[PDB]
Design a protein around this nucleic acid. Structure first.
Ligand SMILES: Nc1ncnc2c1ncn2[C@@H]1O[C@H](COP(=O)(O)OP(=O)(O)O)[C@@H](O)[C@H]1O
Ligand SMILES: Nc1ncnc2c1ncn2[C@@H]1O[C@H](COP(=O)(O)OP(=O)(O)O)[C@@H](O)[C@H]1O
Ligand SMILES: Nc1ncnc2c1ncn2[C@@H]1O[C@H](COP(=O)(O)OP(=O)(O)O)[C@@H](O)[C@H]1O
Ligand SMILES: [Mg+2]
Ligand SMILES: [Mg+2]
Ligand SMILES: [Mg+2]
Lengths: 48, 313, 309, 312, 312, 312, 312
DNA sequence: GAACCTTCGAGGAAG
DNA sequence: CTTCCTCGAAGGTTC
């Protein structure tokens, strides 16, 4: 799941989130198996 | 009907209200979302309230935000992900959005999906985000500052207009029902005429007349009380303030109509240049009473006949 | 005290004073808060004084700040969070607030709520009923969306000689100085229609009466003091008289340009246009013309020159 | 897609289309990159579409960006460094980028190399970099406002021009078939005339007319239906929009035809003076309705008769 | 010392000196601070000198600063916070303060308090800072540059006027005693009449004459040495400089007295329009040698008899 | 490359080359740099190329920049520090440089030193930078565009003028010989006559004609081929461009032949005044199409007959 | 070296040297610093040169800076802190300093102190910096831009004057010795008459003639070589350029000597209105070739004979 | 009616 | 975001 975990942080940072908060935001997702799309969607959906 | 729900209840704006009805009905005839709409017009005409009415007619929810509230692409993408199929997103002051976000909105409006590129270019990958069908409703007072690519994506243009006497009169009559006061139809017309065509101004006058009627009268706004109330407040039958009359009278009495410089005119009425150019002068031009020329301000023949002075070319 | 505390003590401003009395009584009758009031106009007419009177009449404690003291949105939010039901907030020199602050004031005045980003998160605060009072000399500098939200607009106007005479007599009792009725009128004529100027002249005349007289202002001591100050019976200064005298004697009344006039009297161009000339125009002694400014017949009569059309 | 992909498909622009074909095939005969090309003209005439065609005709990857989208030299340097031999770079609004960015463009166009300043303060040096063979394609809206030293670097100029009625009718027919709508040649002709010679405008009106025909009519775009729809949309029989009618009507009714200054006019109608002068006046002037005069704008006799007002 | 310290030593300015005596004496009897005073007028007439005299006569310490030094509200707040009861604060070139900083003095001068934000974050509060009784003194040459609400708060105004020959003669004699110089009364009057009415100019001339008197003379200033020294400086008995004489001579000889335009005259003398208008023309007009008319500059009869020409 | 490298290759400009030859040869006998040279005249005459020739003749490196590209003194100092002994600095459009930067060159050009403030805060200090010997070459349209203090420091003035048909013909033949192409004298002369007297225009036209002759012809340029190729392009039978055609058409059809103000004309043609002033008007005047009068520009009978209007 | 180092070498400006010598010698006897001095006048007359001479004659080190280098008040304060007792500070182009900084010199020049704000920003107080005895030297081309209170503080004013033929001739000879060239007395006088009374122009002309004489001559400048070099330079025997000759000719040929309005003349000469009035006309009026009149400028008899036409 | 001179007013760009 | 200033217009006089 290193691809989805890293891809989420990589794309989330490209969207303007700070690397620190972007890493925490993705790390906060409980399911590790969540796909890149689900991680990015959940991270953004959970931040608003 | 102060806060309408459907076009059946919305007062005024008949042109835009009639056009939007056809496009919504044609959209409903298909399993499709309404095209992106851009609303134009001066401030305070009711643009925000109109967006809510559109959502009800379409039968979808409305998400409200503003351009200044959007600071990074993540904000817009997060907002969009919260929308459901057909939901409407209303962005006020769309002309103030940061360019860094504008370039992202194009793909969402055109493809309903966003592709983000990551990597060193020597090695890179993309992430595809699919968005539910949505309708964007933009509201802006200034159009020229909108970039051509963004304006090209909007497919429906709606123009707001100042309310006419019959429509503005009804707003006063119905607003008078929120309060416990009774207002005669003839008195409501006098306030509407002086409301400069803006609902917020008509509400302000009604509130002031109410205080007078319940203190200097029997708590009823009749023609007699309205005439007195509109006399304590030095508001002309054309809506000109006491200072507005002083400007025109000074130009006619001392300068024979002009040309006269702003500096000279300001010191005569003992006002600041900024005050005369921003508070009083704008409405006088819309009524056609004065014109701006390279040599200075000049009073038109329409001002002469209104103030009651002889005019000669 | 110098500043009147109630409408029974506040002299003049009939138009503004009469309107405010109606609105305050009506608001009390309904147990509601007064609408947002904006006071504007020339300096020294009583804008700040009226703001305190409004609070004393409503019977509420007045919160006070100023535009220059507020520098960031965080400042205004902290102040607004201190308001209690019915509190009145007075912001003097409101035209100095930054644009980023005025945008926050719209929601508070119209929606009674503020949205604060504060681990980053949004907190929504609900404000109780409150009345904002603003005062400024240049209302045109405020944003157009802000002016539209003020429900009461008070435009201050100059005072008449009978009112200024009553003000001079009132101030004389605070200083425990005896002044005759006709002596008070001599100062009122020279006060240029401004209460602050009337007080300034009284203070200066008092100093003379205490050093050169018996400590009493009378029809005789006033003429001596006014001659030492060199203020004409129309309120013209030594430089004001020199301007009219030069225009009539050297240029036959004009038209004469501002530059030429300034150099001849040995004055800075800015000072003539912004300090001395404004009062001469409003009183009708000078007129601005496309070719220059000219001295009117009123100037010839006052200075004692044979008018030649 | 709606936009054409090859010269055989691109409608109109016979002059520009014929010129480019010769130069494109000539370059292939020599097996070298095409010269720097500049496109200019009114917006929405297909300048971007033409760029995609040129790239397809050349068989080269098209990379797109814009003047305002470039903020610092490092941005343009990164873009140029990622160009493969023969690549085509298309930059819209090339006339609006910052002057500091154009410095890099001059050397890139004149000799395919750039010089980058390095260091700060007491340190001040530079590094020379050479660019591989490539072709620049620029697009502008006011060739008269482009930097003179830059304009002289372009070797090919393409003057885009308004489409004629025989061409716009073909575009409406083409678009109507994609939507599977039924439109008669007479109705398509009315839409073309009132489209102000712009393909983008013709598409906007065609979409809106479709919604009207599907409710007020039987789904067939007849002339009687097309005219009723265009009047509902407030589009004059000459293409003057709602704002255009407001301008001309105001001059005749409030200023007796002028002269009136832009400031007064732009304050009477609630519009920014800059918007009136930049977006609306150009069409009214080209049609001869408004004539700029020392004392202000004046309504010509053509505007009086068109609006139905008796001329003086 | 060069600058007078008390009204006994301050020569001239009768109108201002007489008024300040009454206001200072009256303030002492009531045991209260003097009202706020504004001093303005032409350069070098004694504005700064009077500010120090007021403090000595009141018998209090003087705190000094200048407009150009106060660039932000924090600077002014720190100065006011250091005021003690009865202190006098003098601000020279007060017109340079930024407008946003002047608005802080409004409440300080009338009510002796200022409002300051204190605390941190959501806990911040605005609080009144209360100031003890103090007097603000301002000196400026551009009084018209101050805001109307600020000038209205000054309770005392002093407009400086030029000095007359008897006073300037006494000033030259006094300054001559500061140095080890002996000057005959006849020679002292000779310098006063040429000093254009300004004490600083009278002092400047004395220094230049002294240097000559001790290098090309026996170290004593007499009518003989004064004539030779002033001849080298080329200062006319009316104070006209060399260039000032060149102007009047050209107008009388080439234009017959005028009228002549400033531009034309500037070229003939090889000067420039701005130097003639700002340095030379002002004194020539104020003293009556030149008259400005709609047609141009004209030389008066006074200039003819001074230069030695027949007033035909 | 095409660009000439030595005076043996630079055709024309005899009056300029002859002077530069003398000053350069003399400056080489003495171990010192050449005096600062100012080149001025119409754009595209080859003044930038001349800067390269001087550098090659002197045997030193040439650094290039432009007036509008330098925004603050710090930018210019960074460039001057980067110069090596004897290096040549070329500044295009020097008249357009900001005044804040121009006043820094005064000391650098006359004494080779610059006074600058270095450091920050407590470290701020003044340093007297000493520059090595260098030669500045400036370019401008007219000498009257530069301030007197700057113009006085340039020791050599080079006034450039339009090329004559014999010289342009040789340039076309030279250019056409660098490429593997063949051109007959009649075509070369015809192409030169159409080049509006500017070499930069001649080269661009030759490039397009080469592409046409390879696709639409036998690969050899002949009068008949050049006529057709030039007819396919917008170049008229006497060098008038489409912009030139638009100017005359607007002047005659709207203003009735003038007189018309250049500003009012510019805004109607939608072109910047600088372009008409520096590009179109000079040629139209020197070729007798436009006559300059106190009232404004007036179209001549030659223009009337060229466009085909009735010259009453 | 080119710049004269002492009064013994400084040719001309007798009126200024005679005064400066007395003031410097007087200051040395008293063992004091020289009073603040201002040097002003037309461009290139020797203002900067005299500033270095004053320092050398005083026998003290010179600190140098310039007006445009002082961007903010913090820079000037840092410079003033570096002064040592007796130091001379020279500010070239003093008129370029911003008003906000110029007002800081007022106190420093008259009372040798400066008010400054010091502290942590949160807490701060005003303090007096005490300056040692120093001399300020300023040079400006247009003193009119300096504020009246600043000019009044300069105790010594030096107005530079144009040089005469006898003085300007010696400058040419002196410069030739530095170049090791031999110049005949007749040739030295020829160059002087064409130098427009300005030393910088005389040195520029001499350098161009020197380069010519050693490239196509025996390395000697004689009355015969001067004519050839001056012909190549195209400088008439009166110092007129080709533009100046074109003007005078036009007035006589097309207007019979005038009166003619500048607008009319400008059109015939193809020159910009203000360029004629500000660049070329000033010299022609001072030499007597043109005379401004109420009805326009007229060409005098001197212009007729010089141009060779017959006067009437 | 061409040519000079003085004066005011609204832009616009350099702080 | 603001002050400074310069560009354009026109009234008045004279030959
Ligand atoms: N059609 C309308 N019917 C009733 N009230 C209206 C209408 N339009 C405007 N108003 C009143 O005026 C205000 C201004 O309209 P609104 O939509 O809020 O615009 P904005 O958001 O710019 O203030 C409304 O809040 C309401 O009080
Ligand atoms: N010749 C044409 N044929 C078909 N469609 C065209 C043509 N010209 C323009 N269009 C249509 O109008 C739009 C043109 O967009 P674009 O090429 O970006 O114009 P511009 O670059 O001028 O903004 C597209 O939607 C395209 O399909
Ligand atoms: N005398 C000449 N001989 C050969 N080529 C020339 C000559 N003059 C100019 N050119 C060519 O024409 C173009 C001139 O461009 P450039 O020197 O940059 O003109 P400018 O400096 O005026 O912009 C170059 O391609 C140059 O090689
Ligand atoms: Mg107040
Ligand atoms: Mg002082
Ligand atoms: Mg110098």
């Amino acid at each position: 799941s290193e691809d989805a975990e890293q891809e989420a942080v990589a794309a989330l940072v490209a969207l303007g989130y700070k690397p620190q908060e972007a890493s925490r935001m993705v790390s906060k997702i409980a399911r590790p198996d969540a796909s890149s799309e689900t991680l990015i969607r959940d991270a953004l959906r959970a931040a608003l | 009907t102060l806060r309408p729900q459907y076009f059946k209840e919305y007062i005024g704006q008949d042109k835009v209200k009639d056009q939007l009805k056809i496009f919504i009905e044609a959209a409903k005839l298909r399993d499709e979302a309404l095209d992106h709409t851009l609303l134009f017009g001066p401030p305070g005409l009711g643009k925000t309230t109109m967006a809510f009415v559109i959502a009800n007619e379409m039968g979808v929810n409305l998400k409200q935000t503003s351009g200044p509230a959007i600071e990074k692409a993540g904000d817009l993408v997060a907002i969009l992900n919260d929308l459901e199929p057909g939901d409407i997103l209303f962005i006020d002051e769309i002309h103030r959005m940061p360019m860094a976000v504008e370039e992202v909105l194009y793909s969402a409006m055109e493809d309903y999906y966003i592709d983000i590129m990551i990597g060193a270019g020597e090695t890179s990958r993309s992430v595809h985000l699919d968005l539910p069908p949505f309708t964007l409703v933009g509201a802006t007072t200034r159009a020229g500052m909108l970039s051509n690519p963004l304006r090209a994506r909007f497919g429906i243009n709606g123009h707001m207009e100042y309310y006419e006497l019959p429509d503005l009169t009804e707003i006063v009559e119905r607003t008078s029902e929120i309060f416990e006061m009774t207002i005669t139809p003839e008195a409501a017309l006098e306030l509407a005429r002086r409301s400069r065509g803006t609902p917020r101004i008509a509400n302000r006058l009604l509130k002031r007349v109410r205080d007078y009627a319940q203190i200097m009268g029997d708590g009823v706004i009749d023609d007699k009380i309205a005439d007195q109330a509109l006399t304590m407040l030095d508001v002309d039958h054309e809506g000109l303030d006491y200072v507005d009359q002083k400007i025109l009278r000074t130009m006619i009495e001392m300068y024979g109509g002009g040309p006269v410089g702003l500096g000279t005119l300001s010191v005569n009425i003992a006002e600041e240049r900024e005050t005369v150019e921003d508070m009083y002068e704008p409405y006088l031009i819309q009524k056609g009473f004065i014109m701006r020329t390279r040599t200075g301000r000049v009073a038109t023949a329409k001002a002469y006949e209104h103030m009651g002075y002889d005019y000669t070319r």
